[PDB]
From Swiss-Prot:
The keyword Endoplasmic reticulum does not apply. Homodimer. Identified in NR3C1/GCR steroid receptor-chaperone complexes formed at least by NR3C1, HSP90AA1 and a variety of proteins containing TPR repeats such as FKBP4, FKBP5, PPID, PPP5C or STIP1. Forms a complex containing HSP90AA1, TSC1 and TSC2; TSC1 is required to recruit TCS2 to the complex. The closed form interacts (via the middle domain and TPR repeat-binding motif) with co-chaperone TSC1 (via C-terminus). Interacts with TOM34. Interacts with TERT; the interaction, together with PTGES3, is required for correct assembly and stabilization of the TERT holoenzyme complex. (Microbial infection) Interacts with herpes simplex virus 1 protein US11; this interaction inhibits TBK1-induced interferon production. This is Heat shock protein HSP 90-alpha. The chain holds residues 17 to 223 of 732 of the full protein. It is found in: Nucleus; Cytoplasm; Melanosome; Cell membrane. GO terms for biological process: activation of innate immune response; cardiac muscle cell apoptotic process; cellular response to heat; cellular response to virus; chaperone-mediated autophagy; chaperone-mediated protein complex assembly; mitochondrial transport; neurofibrillary tangle assembly.
Amino acid sequence: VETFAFQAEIAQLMSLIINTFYSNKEIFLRELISNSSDALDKIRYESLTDPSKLDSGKELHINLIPNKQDRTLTIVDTGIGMTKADLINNLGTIAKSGTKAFMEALQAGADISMIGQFGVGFYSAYLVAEKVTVITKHNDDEQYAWESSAGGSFTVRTDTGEPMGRGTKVILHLKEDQTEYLEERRIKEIVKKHSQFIGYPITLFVE
Ligand SMILES: Oc1cc2n[nH]c(Cc3ccccc3)c2cc1-c1ccnn1-c1ccccc1
């Protein structure tokens, strides 16, 4: 298991998200669904030139899986997936400029709901989750598990769990007072309100 420090601006953004009083927490789901949608567009675009890139799965979809026993909400996609490099430094480097602009916007009167306009919408997961686990599998690499409970660090390990073929799975270990995002009616309401025009099927699993 490898442990990494977040870049200073990312650690600062995650602390802001965890510490700021902000009741409109539900926007985390739109951000994660939007990220899943972008990765599905990426594999779809790549498959047009190289059809063999879909040999690890033709179906392009998003699954929302609540689990009251484990207190988790899992967002699963069959998108392009991430390499070890994407998890360790590639996406964290791009996120530095977006974090800075978002921080400036907040100081100028913007609110946490506009986070996605800065390409750092993923971190809104920490409005509701005490820990986030990300399992991913790209065609050119092995299966990896990224994990963080904030606090300035994240881990990356080769995933020994069940192979997922291709795509990304975001496991939100919810805070004790945020279990409403495990309720079927609540997830349905949020999906209809913020993610109604996503170009991929979104299946809300039931328990
Ligand atoms: O399909 C995903 C779902 C995601 N949800 N949230 C995260 C963010 C993230 C990154 C690193 C480590 C941890 C989280 C996603 C990332 C991916 C994904 C897979 C491949 N490209 N791509 C991606 C999508 C949008 C922006 C950047 C990359």
